[PDB]
Amino acid sequence: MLSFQYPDVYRDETAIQDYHGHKVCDPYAWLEDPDSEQTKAFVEAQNKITVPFLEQCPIRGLYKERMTELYDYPKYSCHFKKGKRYFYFYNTGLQNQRVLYVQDSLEGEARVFLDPNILSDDGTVALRGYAFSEDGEYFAYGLSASGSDWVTIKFMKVDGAKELPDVLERVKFSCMAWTHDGKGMFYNAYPQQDGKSDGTETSTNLHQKLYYHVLGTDQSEDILCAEFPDEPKWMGGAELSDDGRYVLLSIREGCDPVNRLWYCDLQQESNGITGILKWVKLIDNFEGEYDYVTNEGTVFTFKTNRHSPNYRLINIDFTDPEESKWKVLVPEHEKDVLEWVACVRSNFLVLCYLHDVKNTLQLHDLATGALLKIFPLEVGSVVGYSGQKKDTEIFYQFTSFLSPGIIYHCDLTKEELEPRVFREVTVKGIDASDYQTVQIFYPSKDGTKIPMFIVHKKGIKLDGSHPAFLYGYGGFNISITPNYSVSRLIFVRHMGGVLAVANIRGGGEYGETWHKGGILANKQNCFDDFQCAAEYLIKEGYTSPKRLTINGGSNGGLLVATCANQRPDLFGCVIAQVGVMDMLKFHKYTIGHAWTTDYGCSDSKQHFEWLIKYSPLHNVKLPEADDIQYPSMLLLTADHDDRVVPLHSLKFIATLQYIVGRSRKQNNPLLIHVDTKAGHGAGKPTAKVIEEVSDMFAFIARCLNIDWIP
């Protein structure tokens, strides 16, 4: 099978660093420089072997054609009202970017408001964040190029869709919040830095500040409103209260669901916004999360996890703010996680729960917290919502594994509430009734029961003969809930596969206790959980090791890479997308410092001892048994992934090819593809998405010798 040779890659045998008495050699440290001729030649030599391997077998073109056909369906966001007009996003099917539309009423003719597709030939300029003024008459929007996290904020007048001159640079991980006087907007920016700020650099991002931009001025005139010179990792995001009176400042340090909460009563400013605001430090620690829902005068409703790992709603009165005085408006549930809450039509709350990894949606009274109405849903996820305090209706979008989904609408001015289908699209080519979704709970090594969804053709025999695609993440309080993927459904229908999603620890599926079960000293639980999911699928006869593919992205790329090292015997194929692989150095680059809340940091001897045991870059080892080799492995990254700098995948593939690829017993390929004009994944154009999934499934098909089923 292997008709290519791995490139020669220089080993710097002098690169040796002491970590608390433990010496670590890093012979590919030079790949950390994205700008060197050496690194560019490495990337070119790797792509030169990967691309012909992926493109060689006809299955790729079959898969690409089917993906192009089946993914060509209309894609809508929820409608949302801003001032006098309605807006919604829409893609006719295959446009690189979805387009923002406007209409003057629900029954009115829609017109294009902002079309990002005309901003680049290849769809690589994308919207990243936006904010309407309170009256709906002005619009701020972020644009990102080539998939970078960096944003340029631009502005329009809504009436006539008129471009304005205002442009804000150095924006990253930013809030966007207009004062209700319409004068200007809060946002975040980073200080000037040496070298590039285009998404190809690795430079750490520190000293983010909060600024206020007055509409009609140059950015150089913007007011500095908050900064944390002694705390370089703090990030302060602003929002206005619904009544416009207060700026709420949520300060984060790292990725845990906690924040400080400070507020500024704008009426108490001496002469408007002219400098550092008179912040009142209501919650001045990082012990809990406080997510603003609404206020009524000085009584502020927050979603919190303070001594409530499944989350709850509390009211804090700014005039009596001691914790013993807080009122518990909606108490914590014993198992169900309160995922998010919105206030709509003055005195309603919309609460979205996660119950065994499925969403539910409820309407409650603001004054008492009492349940008023259940909005019924099929098994799946709520992935979109609209309805703010001054609005009198809600829209919400539902999706699941087998349906592209449904947008529902409810007029909350009616005495008897009746949610109704507003938009529904069906994909012809996939008959949902041919398939089933099951949820099972399997025991991990320590006995903990882990949820797993399995999607497969009805009536299959559990004889171990089916290819399987097992997905996980496991970190950052992220819950992996049902979602519609045509790409995975083509694997089911046209490659005879079984899909599985394991809700391993580290996620948010059972609240903060689930999250803490997969972090820090307990990160190995994630890997144990995922290996046990694979063992379940095999024992129960869905698949066999030689037919099993595992996949994950980002923290999920770490998951599958560590699993390949720890249990190479368990997997046929591993696809790691944009993965963090050097666990000793991840904190040095871009925003990597923020991830230490889940992983720890190698500057601590205690944390080093955890990290070294699972870091993918540091645990590449030939399997001891003669009959065991590494699975086929594909790493996917891109040259503007400034979220997870691509050096992670470059150093890891060099290591895999040297330690494992040189061994005579290794016949499964170990490959990387580095894309151009792309980043971590947000904003990726349709054309690139299609190529990426065609690559993934071609790699699976070729490595496992799976026939296409027309």
Interatomic CA distance for residues 487 and 696, integer angstroms = 10
Counts of helices then strands in the chain (DSSP H, E): 10, 39
Q: In b/e form, how buried is each residue of 540-563, taking b as 16+ CB within 10 angstroms? A: eebbbbebbbbbbbbbbbbbbbbb
Question: 695: part of which helix (H) or strand (E)?
Answer: helix 686-704
Instruction: Give residue 461's region: left, alpha or beta (phi > 0; psi -120 to 50).
Output: beta
* Catalytic choice (456, 648, 673, 680): 680
Interatomic CA distance for residues 185 and 133, integer angstroms = 8
Q: How many Å separate Cα 346 from the centre of its chain?
A: 31
First-to-last C-alpha distance (Å) of the chain: 25
Interatomic CA distance for residues 159 and 113, integer angstroms = 10
Handedness of CA 262, 268, 271, 272 (dihedral sign): positive
149's CB contacts (< 8 A; 6+ apart) are 128, 172, 173, 199, 590, 591, 642, 643, 679, 680
Interatomic CA distance for residues 28 and 30, integer angstroms = 5
Domains of the chain: 1-73+427-710 (3.40.50.1820), 74-426 (2.130.10.120)
Of 404, 494, 400, 493, nearest to 453 by C-alpha is 400
Instruction: Look up residue 285 and give its two tokens.
Output: 């620690």
* Catalytic choice (222, 242, 641, 675): 641
154's CB contacts (< 8 A; 6+ apart) are 140, 141, 142, 143, 163, 164, 166, 167
Residue 325 DSSP symbol = G
Interatomic CA distance for residues 31 and 42, integer angstroms = 8
Strand order in the sheet with 209-214: 176-178, 184-189, 209-214, 223-226
Interatomic CA distance for residues 673 and 631, integer angstroms = 17
Residue 572 DSSP symbol = S
How far is residue 651 from each of residues 18, 26, 325, 575, 620, measured CA to CA in Å? 19, 9, 54, 16, 11
416's CB contacts (< 8 A; 6+ apart) are none
237's CB contacts (< 8 A; 6+ apart) are 174, 175, 188, 210, 249, 250, 251, 252
128 contacts 682 by C-beta, under 8 angstroms: yes
Q: In b/e form, how buried is each residue of 79-93, taking b as 16+ CB within 10 angstroms? A: bbbbeebbbbbbbee
The DSSP bridge pattern shows strands 176-178 and 75-76 to be: unpaired
Handedness of CA 620, 621, 623, 629 (dihedral sign): positive
Question: 38: part of which helix (H) or strand (E)?
Answer: helix 37-56
Interatomic CA distance for residues 501 and 451, integer angstroms = 9
Q: Is 381 a catalytic residue?
A: no
Interatomic CA distance for residues 208 and 186, integer angstroms = 13
Q: Is 554 a catalytic residue?
A: yes
Cβ-in-10-Å burial (0-12, 13-18, 19+) of 605 comes to: exposed
Cβ-in-10-Å burial (0-12, 13-18, 19+) of 110 comes to: middle
Q: What experimental approach yielded this model?
A: X-ray
118 contacts 127 by C-beta, under 8 angstroms: no
DSSP per-residue string spanning 39-96: HHHHHHHHHHHHHHHHHHSTHHHHHHHHHHHHH-S-EEPPPEEETTEEEEEEE-SS-S
Interatomic CA distance for residues 611 and 252, integer angstroms = 24
397 contacts 384 by C-beta, under 8 angstroms: yes
Residue 116 corresponds to which amino acid? P
Interatomic CA distance for residues 299 and 369, integer angstroms = 14
Write phi, then psi, for 347 (nearest 5 degrees): -130, 20
Q: Is 270 a catalytic residue?
A: no
* Catalytic choice (241, 403, 479, 554): 554
Residue 444 CB neighbours (<10 A):
22
